[PDB]
Amino acid sequence: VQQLSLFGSIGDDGYDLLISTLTTISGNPPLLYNSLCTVWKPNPSYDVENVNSRNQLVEPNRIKLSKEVPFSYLIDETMMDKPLNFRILKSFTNDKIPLNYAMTRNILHNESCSPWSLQISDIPAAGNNRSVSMQTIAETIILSSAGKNSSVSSLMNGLGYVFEFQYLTIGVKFFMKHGLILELQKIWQIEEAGNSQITSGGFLLKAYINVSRGTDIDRINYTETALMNLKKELQGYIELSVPDRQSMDSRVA
Amino acid sequence: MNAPDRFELFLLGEGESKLKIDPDTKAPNAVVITFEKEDHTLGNLIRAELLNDRKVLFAAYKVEHPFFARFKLRIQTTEGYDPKDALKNACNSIINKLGALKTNFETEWNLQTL
């Protein structure tokens, strides 16, 4: 899959406004969502060349397991209660939900496992000046597991990977025109020695479109336009820009 | 150096069927079977047997170039008769003829004391 995207940010200050605005531009409400991502690297004990049985220069990369956490495993207070995601995010700022996230990695709270989104991405498309961030993603869905060691952690080890780092993200997304999505988000590093919000101070803004093609230059070029239109329409309110490629490279590093 | 591997003569290529049956445009009820990793050994044998079939109107084979082990066989039959069936029968007749040939040689050999 091809993910064309634009990024930016707002302090928690700007959120309230941005929201009211984004709802009008898109005509849909923001919808509350979250997801945990667990990153894995090749087992540093094993060691392998960078070539195939089909002499191909192939680089080691990280794997990313992603999925939803039902909010019941995430939220601090019922008193706050409510359905509203933005006023709720202030509640979440600076610091962690229950987490300790290890628990879920190996079941608990005699067990099989969930579905995951197993992904691996390449550095965004080399480009002298790109109007948009264009990134390739290889994905498969894991449906459930079976066998002796059926915990997701066992599975990853069986395949020769090792857990590297992880993070939770909670936000609202806007469903929009021609597959355009806008996520207003917050990210939290999850370690065993406690959790900290990566996005502390505000929200990561991501406007994107996943395209099935890649090899339909036309739909690719259409997609560029879509993103451009957005950045443009909001220009003078918020700049959507292309992130540094180097900063989106999940390789060995 | 520019020499192809010797097994290329008999060992089928990656995704390459023994037979490729294409229909002849220029003539009604006519077809063209391309035989990969095959030579005269089989071509001339089949062609000659199809000639024995009365319901077969046209039959010929050609090895378009010697660097490649493949041959095109063109079969034309009377209306109603299928050329694939014609080829099927000639193939069968050949086997049955060879079967008797073996049986007859075996019997005759066993009679010899040398």
């Binding site: - | 003539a27 009365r54 109107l57 009377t78």
Partner: protein, 133 residues
Amino acid sequence: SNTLFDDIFQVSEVDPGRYNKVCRIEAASTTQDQCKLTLDINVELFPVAAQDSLTVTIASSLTRSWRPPQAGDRSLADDYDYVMYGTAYKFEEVSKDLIAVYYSFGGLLMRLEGNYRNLNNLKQENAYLLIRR
């Protein structure tokens, strides 16, 4: 669809000048004095010696591709011993009411000299040559 010429000739000479399997035959009609014939024949297939009486027929039929057997059940338009198929290539006006027609049966040449068959012979690819006795 029908016959174009019929007569019985008598061979005067047979010639295989260097040719091992073919012969130029010289004949004249037993009926009409005006009528003569020159013809190349596959003598390895149907042998011919001089003074042989031979029925020589033309006919425009009995187009598209050629079929080999089934001729067992099919009507073999040959009540004759040797048959050829060729093309008419020249119409020589050899004086008076006299005409001469040239036929090539794939290289095997033929020259028929006479008069009457004005209302018969034509410049056609279609022309069979039938011979009996």
